[PDB]
Amino acid sequence: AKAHIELTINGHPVEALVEPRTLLIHFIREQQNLTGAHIGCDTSHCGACTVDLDGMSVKSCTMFAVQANGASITTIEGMAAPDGTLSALQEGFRMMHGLQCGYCTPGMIMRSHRLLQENPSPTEAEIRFGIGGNLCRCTGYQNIVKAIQYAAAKINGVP
Amino acid sequence: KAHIELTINGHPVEALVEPRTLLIHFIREQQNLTGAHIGCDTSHCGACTVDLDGMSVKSCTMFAVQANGASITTIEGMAAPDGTLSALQEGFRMMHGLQCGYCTPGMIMRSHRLLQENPSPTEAEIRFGIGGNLCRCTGYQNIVKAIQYAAAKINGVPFEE
Amino acid sequence: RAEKLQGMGCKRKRVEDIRFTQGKGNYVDDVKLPGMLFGDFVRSSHAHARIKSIDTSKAKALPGVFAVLTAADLKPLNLHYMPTLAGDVQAVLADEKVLFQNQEVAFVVAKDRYVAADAIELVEVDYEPLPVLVDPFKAMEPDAPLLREDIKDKMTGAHGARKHHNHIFRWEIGDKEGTDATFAKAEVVSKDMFTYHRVHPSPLETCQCVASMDKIKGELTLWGTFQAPHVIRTVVSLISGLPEHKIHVIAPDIGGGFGNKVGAYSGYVCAVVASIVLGVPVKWVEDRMENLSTTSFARDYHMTTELAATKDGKILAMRCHVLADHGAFDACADPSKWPAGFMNICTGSYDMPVAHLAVDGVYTNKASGGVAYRCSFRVTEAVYAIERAIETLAQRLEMDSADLRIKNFIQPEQFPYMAPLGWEYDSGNYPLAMKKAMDTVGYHQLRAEQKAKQEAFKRGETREIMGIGISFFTEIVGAGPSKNCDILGVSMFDSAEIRIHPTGSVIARMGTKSQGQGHETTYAQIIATELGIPADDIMIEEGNTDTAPYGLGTYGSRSTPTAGAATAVAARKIKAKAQMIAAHMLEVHEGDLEWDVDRFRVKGLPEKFKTMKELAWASYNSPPPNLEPGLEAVNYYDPPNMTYPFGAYFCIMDIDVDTGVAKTRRFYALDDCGTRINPMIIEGQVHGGLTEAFAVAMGQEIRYDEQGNVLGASFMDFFLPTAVETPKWETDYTVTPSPHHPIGAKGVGESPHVGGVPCFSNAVNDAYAFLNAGHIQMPHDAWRLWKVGEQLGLHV
Amino acid sequence: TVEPTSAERAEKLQGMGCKRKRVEDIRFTQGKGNYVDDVKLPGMLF
Amino acid sequence: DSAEIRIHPTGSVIARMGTKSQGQGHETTYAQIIATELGIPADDIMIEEGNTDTAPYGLGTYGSRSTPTAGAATAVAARKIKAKAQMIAAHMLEVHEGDLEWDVDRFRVKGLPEKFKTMKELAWASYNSPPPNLEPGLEAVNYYDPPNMTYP
Amino acid sequence: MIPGSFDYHRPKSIADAVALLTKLGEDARPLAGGHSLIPIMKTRLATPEHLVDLRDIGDLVGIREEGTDVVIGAMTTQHALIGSDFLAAKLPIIRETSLLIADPQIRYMGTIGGNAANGDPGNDMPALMQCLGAAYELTGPEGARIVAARDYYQGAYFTAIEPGELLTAIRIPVPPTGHGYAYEKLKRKIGDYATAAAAVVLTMSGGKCVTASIGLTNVANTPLWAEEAGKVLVGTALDKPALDKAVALAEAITAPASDGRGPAEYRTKMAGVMLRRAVERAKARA
Numbered sequence A: 001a002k003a004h005i006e007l008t009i010n011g012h013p014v015e016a017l018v019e020p021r022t023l024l025i026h027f028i029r030e031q032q033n034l035t036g037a038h039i040g041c042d043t044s045h046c047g048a049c050t051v052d053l054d055g056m057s058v059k060s061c062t063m064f065a066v067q068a069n070g071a072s073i074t075t076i077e078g079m080a081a082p083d084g085t086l087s088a089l090q091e092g093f094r095m096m097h098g099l100q101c102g103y104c105t106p107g108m109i110m111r112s113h114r115l116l117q118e119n120p121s122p123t124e125a126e127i128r129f130g131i132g133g134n135l136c137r138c139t140g141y142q143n144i145v146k147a148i149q150y151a152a153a154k155i156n157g158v159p
Numbered sequence B: 001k002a003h004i005e006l007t008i009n010g011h012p013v014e015a016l017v018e019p020r021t022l023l024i025h026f027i028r029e030q031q032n033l034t035g036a037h038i039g040c041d042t043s044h045c046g047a048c049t050v051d052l053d054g055m056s057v058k059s060c061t062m063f064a065v066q067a068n069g070a071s072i073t074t075i076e077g078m079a080a081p082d083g084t085l086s087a088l089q090e091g092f093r094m095m096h097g098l099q100c101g102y103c104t105p106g107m108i109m110r111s112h113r114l115l116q117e118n119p120s121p122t123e124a125e126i127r128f129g130i131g132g133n134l135c136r137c138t139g140y141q142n143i144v145k146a147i148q149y150a151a152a153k154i155n156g157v158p159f160e161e
Numbered sequence C: 001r002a003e004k005l006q007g008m009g010c011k012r013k014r015v016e017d018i019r020f021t022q023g024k025g026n027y028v029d030d031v032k033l034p035g036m037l038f039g040d041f042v043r044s045s046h047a048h049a050r051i052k053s054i055d056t057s058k059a060k061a062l063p064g065v066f067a068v069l070t071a072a073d074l075k076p077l078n079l080h081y082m083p084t085l086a087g088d089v090q091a092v093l094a095d096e097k098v099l100f101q102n103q104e105v106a107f108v109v110a111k112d113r114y115v116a117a118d119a120i121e122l123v124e125v126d127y128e129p130l131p132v133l134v135d136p137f138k139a140m141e142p143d144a145p146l147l148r149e150d151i152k153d154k155m156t157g158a159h160g161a162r163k164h165h166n167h168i169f170r171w172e173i174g175d176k177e178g179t180d181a182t183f184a185k186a187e188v189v190s191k192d193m194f195t196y197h198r199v200h201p202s203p204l205e206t207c208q209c210v211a212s213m214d215k216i217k218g219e220l221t222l223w224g225t226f227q228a229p230h231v232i233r234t235v236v237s238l239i240s241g242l243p244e245h246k247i248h249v250i251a252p253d254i255g256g257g258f259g260n261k262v263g264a265y266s267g268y269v270c271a272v273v274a275s276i277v278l279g280v281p282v283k284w285v286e287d288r289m290e291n292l293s294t295t296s297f298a299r300d301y302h303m304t305t306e307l308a309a310t311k312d313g314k315i316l317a318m319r320c321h322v323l324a325d326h327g328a329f330d331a332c333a334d335p336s337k338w339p340a341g342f343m344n345i346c347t348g349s350y351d352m353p354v355a356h357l358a359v360d361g362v363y364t365n366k367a368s369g370g371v372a373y374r375c376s377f378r379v380t381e382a383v384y385a386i387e388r389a390i391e392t393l394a395q396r397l398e399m400d401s402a403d404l405r406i407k408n409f410i411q412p413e414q415f416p417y418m419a420p421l422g423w424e425y426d427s428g429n430y431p432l433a434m435k436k437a438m439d440t441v442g443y444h445q446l447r448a449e450q451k452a453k454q455e456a457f458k459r460g461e462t463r464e465i466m467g468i469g470i471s472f473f474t475e476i477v478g479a480g481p482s483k484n485c486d487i488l489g490v491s492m493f494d495s496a497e498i499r500i501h502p503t504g505s506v507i508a509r510m511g512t513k514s515q516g517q518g519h520e521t522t523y524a525q526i527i528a529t530e531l532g533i534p535a536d537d538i539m540i541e542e543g544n545t546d547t548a549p550y551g552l553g554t555y556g557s558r559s560t561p562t563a564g565a566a567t568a569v570a571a572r573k574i575k576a577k578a579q580m581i582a583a584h585m586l587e588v589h590e591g592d593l594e595w596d597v598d599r600f601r602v603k604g605l606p607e608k609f610k611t612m613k614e615l616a617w618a619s620y621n622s623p624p625p626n627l628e629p630g631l632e633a634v635n636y637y638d639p640p641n642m643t644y645p646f647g648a649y650f651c652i653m654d655i656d657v658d659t660g661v662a663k664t665r666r667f668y669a670l671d672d673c674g675t676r677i678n679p680m681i682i683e684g685q686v687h688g689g690l691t692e693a694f695a696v697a698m699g700q701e702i703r704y705d706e707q708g709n710v711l712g713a714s715f716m717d718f719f720l721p722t723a724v725e726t727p728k729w730e731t732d733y734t735v736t737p738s739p740h741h742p743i744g745a746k747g748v749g750e751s752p753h754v755g756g757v758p759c760f761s762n763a764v765n766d767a768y769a770f771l772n773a774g775h776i777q778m779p780h781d782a783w784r785l786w787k788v789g790e791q792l793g794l795h796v
Numbered sequence D: 001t002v003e004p005t006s007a008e009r010a011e012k013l014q015g016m017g018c019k020r021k022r023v024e025d026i027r028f029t030q031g032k033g034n035y036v037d038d039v040k041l042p043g044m045l046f
Numbered sequence E: 001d002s003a004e005i006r007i008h009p010t011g012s013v014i015a016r017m018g019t020k021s022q023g024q025g026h027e028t029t030y031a032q033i034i035a036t037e038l039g040i041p042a043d044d045i046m047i048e049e050g051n052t053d054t055a056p057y058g059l060g061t062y063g064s065r066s067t068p069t070a071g072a073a074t075a076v077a078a079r080k081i082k083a084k085a086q087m088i089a090a091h092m093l094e095v096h097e098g099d100l101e102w103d104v105d106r107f108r109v110k111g112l113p114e115k116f117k118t119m120k121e122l123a124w125a126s127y128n129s130p131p132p133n134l135e136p137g138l139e140a141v142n143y144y145d146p147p148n149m150t151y152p
Numbered sequence F: 001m002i003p004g005s006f007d008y009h010r011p012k013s014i015a016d017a018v019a020l021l022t023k024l025g026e027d028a029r030p031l032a033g034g035h036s037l038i039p040i041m042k043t044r045l046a047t048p049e050h051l052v053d054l055r056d057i058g059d060l061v062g063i064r065e066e067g068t069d070v071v072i073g074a075m076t077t078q079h080a081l082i083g084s085d086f087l088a089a090k091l092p093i094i095r096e097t098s099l100l101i102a103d104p105q106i107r108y109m110g111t112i113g114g115n116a117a118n119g120d121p122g123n124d125m126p127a128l129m130q131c132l133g134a135a136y137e138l139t140g141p142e143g144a145r146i147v148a149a150r151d152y153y154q155g156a157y158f159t160a161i162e163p164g165e166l167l168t169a170i171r172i173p174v175p176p177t178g179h180g181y182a183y184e185k186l187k188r189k190i191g192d193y194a195t196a197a198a199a200v201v202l203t204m205s206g207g208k209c210v211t212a213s214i215g216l217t218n219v220a221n222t223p224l225w226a227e228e229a230g231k232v233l234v235g236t237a238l239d240k241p242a243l244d245k246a247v248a249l250a251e252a253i254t255a256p257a258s259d260g261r262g263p264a265e266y267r268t269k270m271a272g273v274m275l276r277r278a279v280e281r282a283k284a285r286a
C-alpha cells in the first residue's frame, strides 16, 4: 500500500510511489537520484540531509517522503542557475574555502540559502547560530562563515 | 503502449512497449540484454538473432509486440547457472570462432538452434545452416569448427574433422 | 601566463569544489549499479558472550532477503576472520563468541536497506554471557576473562610474546638503564598518569562500500571508503584468492576519513563475499551509531609519564609507560614494526639525553582501532604526554612553562636531530616560532592578567578562572622509509605518474587518496611550478587502483611527504627529458640550456628558447631520434626520512567554576610545515584539526560501562561542535623547509589535532593549577570541570 | 607440479608462439562485450 | 606506439597500449609477448586499450601496425622491467647481474641453479624490499619509434 | 535509522484525527513536526502501526490572545513562536525558550504541542508551561478537557493524555506587563537537551517580588514546577538569602538522570544555578 506523492523538486514536478516509512532523504537520494544531499547521522543532528522545503530548512532524514507530498523542495542540485552559473553561496563556498570533503556542503548551502533569506545581512553570531543544525568535520566552520558573508555581499550587490 | 508478458532466458518479463519498437531494441534498450547486436538495416546479417519459441529469429525484423507470450533465449541465457559455458560458447572460444565478437551472440544463438535442428551436421550443412549470419572477421572457417566442436561435445562423439 | 600558472604557494581555489558545491561528488552511497543489493549486519547486543545459536530462518524467509551470512558461511573461505594491519585477525562475523557490543554477527543482504533493516531484526541470537572486561587496568589480572580464545594457546602474537592471554604486545624502546639511572638521581621527578580517552574520528560520511563481483569475467570491482585503496586491493587479493589484476578497487570521493577509513572492516569483506556468492553488487553503508561503536576508535592510552629534571628546569630524561586499550582485536593501524606507532616521538620538541618508553597493549571487550583521528601513529598521544608533562613539571618546579620549554628546546642548529627514542628530526626552528607565538598573544601580559584574576577569585570578586594553554609540538609525518615503514610488508613509499599530452595538458595520478585535503588541487600546483604548465591544464586523479600508480594511501599526513615528493620527482624527470628535447631542437648541448619558468633558453642567447608547451608537442611531433617519443614519467618515492613539522599553539580559556563551562577566549596556532603549497588549504586543514582538538579535549568520548555497553556512541552525546561552539581560530606560520623533501614541504594535516588537544587540555589544567587541581583528565566538559571545582571546595 | 621443468613453466606461460585461447571470448560469447551502442547514460539523447 | 606495463605486488600485471583492437586479439596476444618476456603467465596479465585517460598515447590500430609498433613497445617495456628485475635479483641473491641467467621465469645464479629468484618473487620484492638504489615497484613504459616498417 | 513500516494518515480536522486515533488505538500515534517521534521510530523504540499526521489541520496552528490568556495551537512551530512579535510582547519568555530548543531545521518543524505532549523530560516547553501555569486543552472521543501543565507529566513518556486525545492548544495566562522572565539553559552544545534549565517569571513592586514561578527542565523524569521555590521569593528583594532559599527548595525536588550530561548531583546543582541566573535576569527585566 505505497502512497502516491506529487511534489516539486528543483522546480520540476515529481510523482512517485513511496512506502510511508521511506525517509525523505532516501526518497531524494535513492528514488530521485539526487545524491547531493547526504546522510551523516542517524539521530537528526548533522544537517547533511538539509533541503529547502516550502521555505524551510528541513532535515530530510527526519521526515517521511509522504510528509513532503505537495511540497516544493530545493536540493543542492537546484541551486545553480539555469545557465550553469553558481549561486552566490556555491561561489562563496568555493572562493572562501568553505568545504573540504564536500560531504556537509550540500546541506550547508541549502541551510545557508534559507538563512540568507531569513536574514540577508547576518552578523557572524547570527551566521553561526543560524547554521547550528549543520555539522562539518572538515572546516571548523570559520571559512563557512566567510563563505556565507561572501555570498551575502554578492547577493546584496545584485539588485 | 502495448502490454506484453513473455519469458526471456527463462525469466518472466512484463513490459509496456510501443508497437513499432523492434524486438532487438526492446531486448537491448529496455531489457538491457545488449549481447544481441545490430549489424544492418536490411535483415541480412543475423547479428540480432535470438531463439524465440524454438526458432532462430532476426530480432531486428520483428516488433516486440509480436513476441508477446514468447519464450526467448538471448546469448545471456546460454551459459549454465553454474557459470559453465554452453558447448557452443566453449566451441567458439576453443576453435577461435570469433574475433571482434560482434556477430558472436547471433552466431551462437543461431547455432544453438541449428544443432537442435541437426545435431550432427556436415560442414556443408553447417555453412548453409548459418547462412543468415554474417561475420566480417573470421572468414567462417573457424565458426564451422566451433559448431562442429559443440556438436561433438553435445553428442559425446565427433563426426567430421 | 602569470595569471594562469597557479603553482606552488598560490591560494589556488579548489577544483573539487565545483562538483561538491553542486552535489556532483561521487561518494560510495551515490553509487548505483544494476542488480545492486544492500547488506548490513546483525550486531551483538552483548559485549562478551558465547553465541549458542543464530537463527536466521525468519530473516532468510523474509521477502527481499537474498542471503544471511554467518560465520558458518565464511569459514570455508577462511574469511570468518580477516587479517589486520596490526598482524592480528579480527572476526568478520562472530563465530563462537562475541567480544564487543555491536560486533558483527550476521550479514543480511536484501533488496534495499529498508528490507535489510527489517530482516536484521528477525535474526535471533542466543547468547551465553561471559564476564566482561572493560577496564584495561584489570585486563592482565589472573582472573581476567579469556577474551581471545581463538588465539589463546598462542603466547606469541605478531609483536612478540604475550605474557597473559589479554596481553597483545609489549613494546619498548630507548635506553632503559640510562633512563632509570637518571630517574634514580634526578633532583625532580615529575610523574603523572595521563589518560588520552577513547574518542572516534567520526567522519561525516561513515564507512561503506559497493562490492561487485563480475562472475562472468571473474573480476571484482570494489568501490569503497578507502584511504588506501591499493593496499585494500592487495589485501583483498591475498584473502580472496583473486589476483590483483582482477580486483578493481575504486575509492571515489570520500566524505572525510580522518583515519577511520584506512583499514578493512567486516562490512567490506561481507559485501565482497556476498557479491561473490550472489554474483550481483552488494552495497554496505553503516549508520552513525555503528560507525562510532564498531569502527576504529582513537586514543585510549593510559600514559604513565615521567620527566626527570633539575630544579632549574633542565630536562634530563623521560620515562613513559603506556597501557594501550586496543579493544577486542588488535586492528590498530600502524606500520608493521610499530605496535605503538610512533609513540616514541614522545620526547617532543626538547633536547633530552635519554628516554625510555614501554607500551603494553591489552584486549578488552570493545571495538578495535586506536590509530585514527589525526594521530599520525600515536603522535597525538606522544605529544599530549610530553606537553602535559612539561606543564606538570613546570608546576612542580614553580616555573613558567613557556620558560621551561624555551630552556629545553632543540635548537635549530641541532637539526637533523637524533632524538633519544630514535627519530631523527629533519629541521625545526622552535625558539623563533615560540617567540613569534608568545609575542603575538602577549604571553607575559596574559600571565599577569591571570595572576590578577586569580587574586580576584580568591577575594570572591569573580567566579571565572583563566587558563593559558601552551602546546609546542613536533610532529612526525610522511611514513616512511622502506627500512622501517611498511604496511603488512609493503614499503611505505608513494607514487606519481605524470603524462603530458601533445597539446600540453597533463594527466597525473598518485598513489594517495584524498578525503577532502585538496590533493586534486594541490598536486597540480606542484607540477605547475615544476613544468610551467598552468595548474588548470593538469588533471589529478587518485583512488582507482587500475589507473593510479601503486601507493600506500593517505593517512599520517603523508601525502605531501610521499606523493608530493613523487610528484615533484616525476615532474623533474619530465623536465629533464624536455631539456633533452630542447637541446635537440635548439641544436645545443643540454648544458647550454637553462630553465626559465616555462621554457628552456640557450645560455647567453635568451632569445633562443623552447617552451614546455612546444617541447611537449615536439615529443610527439619531432621526437629526437635518440629518445622515445612522448613526455611522461613515474616516480615511486621512498622517503629518506619522515618530515617533522612543528607548531606553537596558545589557548586562553576562561572557565566558570560554578558550572564547569569553559569558553575559549583566543586560540592561536602557529604551524610550520615547511614549504607551503597552498596556504588556503593549509589554513582549512588547521581550522578543521583545531576543531577536532577542541572536541576531543572538551567533550568527545566513547565509553563503556561495566557491562560493556558502549556509551555515548551517537550524536546525541558524542560532542561534535557546531559553528556556535567552535572557537575562532587565529593561525600563523613559519617556514622551515624539510631539507630532504624535493620541494621542502612537510605534512601538516594532523598537526592541528596533535598540537591542539594538549593546548586545550593544558589551558584547562592551567586554569585550575593555582587551586592545585592536579592533572585533570580529559574531556573537560562542564560536569567534569564542575566536579573538579566541587572537589576543590569552590562551591561552598 | 610444485617444481615444474623449464619446459613446463614455459608452457604454462602461454606466451609467444602459443595458440593461447582468447580472453576476449569469455565476455563476447556471453554478450558481455561493451560496444558503443551498449552504453546508456542518464539523460542520454540520440 | 606505446606500452605501459605495471606489475602488482603479488605478481599480476596491468598493461596498456596505444593501439586499439577491433577484434585482432590484442588483449590476448600482447599478454603473450609480456608473458614470455617476464615469465609471468599470460593469464596473470590484464591488457587494456582505448581509454585515452589511461592508455599511453599511441597512434591506434591500422596498417597492421600493432605488432610492429605496440608489440615492439610491449617487448621493450617488458625488457625494461626485466632489466630492473635482474637488478633486484642480483641484489637479493648477492651476486652481480652478469652472474645471473634467465630460465623462463626466474633468474638463477650461473653454476648455482638452486639460487634463484622468480619474477613473482622479484615483483613482491620491488614493493616489499626495494633495493636502496632503485625505486619501489616494477613497471615500465616504452614509446617505440620504429626504425623501418616490417615487410611480411 | 530505518523505522518499521506503518500506515500514514492525513486527517483533515481535529474531529477526524481524534476519531482515527480512537479507532486505531494504541498502535496509532499523532505525527506533528516528527522531530521526536521520527527519531524514535528510526531507532525502533517506537513501532507504531499508524501515524496520524496533523499537518492538514489548520486550526491546530496559531497564536491568539483570548481573555487573560494567549492560546497557541498545538501545531504552531517553534519557528513561528519565535517569529511572533505579538508573543514576544506578551510572553517574551517563549521566544527566549524556543531559541534554546534544537536548531533551525528542527525548529522549522517541531511544534509546541509536540514538545509539550512528548513526555521526554528533555523537552524545554513542559517546564516553561508549568512555570507559566499553562493549561493544555485536550480533545478526545469523550470531548474537551483541560489539564494543567503542572499536572500533565508523570514520567518519561508518561502524561495525562488519554487514548484518542489530541492536545489541541496551550492556554497560557498572560503575565502582567513589565513582568520579569528568563529561560536559562545549560547544555552541552546546540541542540542538546538541557543538563538543567530553569524557567522563571516574576513581577516586582517597590523593590520586592510580588509573584514568582519557576519551572525546571530535565532534572527529573518530568518537568518540575518548583512551587515552594517560587513562593519563597515572594515578598523578598530577590537578594542572596532569598535566592539561596529558592535554590534549596528547587534542588530538593530534583531527581535527575545520570547520563552524558553528568551525574545527578551535578544536574541538581545546575538546576539551582540556572534558577539563580534566570531569577537574576528576570529581576533585571521586571
Ligand SMILES: Cc1cc2nc3c(=O)[nH]c(=O)nc-3n(C[C@H](O)[C@H](O)[C@H](O)COP(=O)(O)OP(=O)(O)OC[C@H]3O[C@@H](n4cnc5c(N)ncnc54)[C@H](O)[C@@H]3O)c2cc1C
Residues within 6 Å of the ligand: A043, A044, A045, F029, F030, F031, F032, F033, F034, F035, F036, F037, F038, F039, F074, F075, F100, F101, F102, F103, F106, F109, F110, F111, F112, F113, F114, F115, F116, F117, F118, F122, F123, F124, F125, F161, F165, F166, F167, F168, F191, F192, F193, F194
Ligand atoms: C537533534 C534534536 C535536538 C532537539 N533538541 C531539543 C531541545 O533542545 N529542546 C526541546 O525542547 N526539544 C528538542 N528536540 C525535540 C523537538 O523540539 C521536537 O520537535 C519535539 O520534542 C516534539 O515536537 P514535534 O512537533 O516534533 O512532535 P512529534 O515528534 O511529531 O511528536 C512527539 C510526540 O508527541 C505526540 N504528539 C505530537 N503532537 C501531539 C498532539 N498535538 N497531541 C497529542 N500528542 C501529540 C506524538 O504522537 C509523539 O508521541 C530536539 C530534536 C532533535 C531531533
Ligand SMILES: Nc1ccn([C@@H]2O[C@H](COP(=O)(O)OP(=O)(O)OC[C@H]3Oc4nc5nc(N)nc(O)c5nc4C(S)=C3S)[C@@H](O)[C@H]2O)c(=O)n1
Residues within 6 Å of the ligand: A100, A101, A138, C256, C257, C258, C259, C372, C373, C374, C375, C515, C516, C517, C518, C519, C522, C523, C554, C555, C556, C557, C558, C559, C560, C561, C673, C674, C675, C676, C677, C678, C679, C681, C682, C685, C688, C745, C746, C747, C748, C749, C750
Ligand atoms: N607543506 C604543505 C603541506 C600540506 N599542504 C596541503 O595540505 C593538504 C594536506 O596535506 P598533508 O598534510 O600532506 O596531509 P594529507 O593530504 O596526507 O592528509 C591526511 C591528513 O588529513 C587530515 N585532514 C583531513 N581533512 C579533510 N578534509 N578530510 C580528512 O579526512 C582529513 N583527515 C586528516 C588526517 S587523519 C590526515 S592523516 C594537501 O592538499 C597539501 O598539498 C600544503 O599546501 N603544503
Ligand code: FES
Residues within 6 Å of the ligand: A038, A039, A040, A041, A042, A043, A044, A045, A046, A047, A048, A049, A050, A059, A060, A061, A062
Ligand atoms: S542525516 Fe539528517 S540530520 Fe544527519
Ligand code: FES
Residues within 6 Å of the ligand: A098, A099, A100, A101, A102, A103, A104, A105, A135, A136, A137, A138, A139, C204, C255, C256, C516
Ligand atoms: S566539508 Fe567535510 S564535513 Fe564539511
Ligand code: FES
Residues within 6 Å of the ligand: B037, B038, B039, B040, B041, B042, B043, B044, B045, B046, B047, B048, B049, B058, B059, B060, B061
Ligand atoms: S541487425 Fe538483424 S539481420 Fe542485421
Ligand code: FES
Residues within 6 Å of the ligand: B097, B098, B099, B100, B101, B102, B103, B104, B134, B135, B136, B137, B138, E023
Ligand atoms: S567476430 Fe567480428 S563480425 Fe564475426
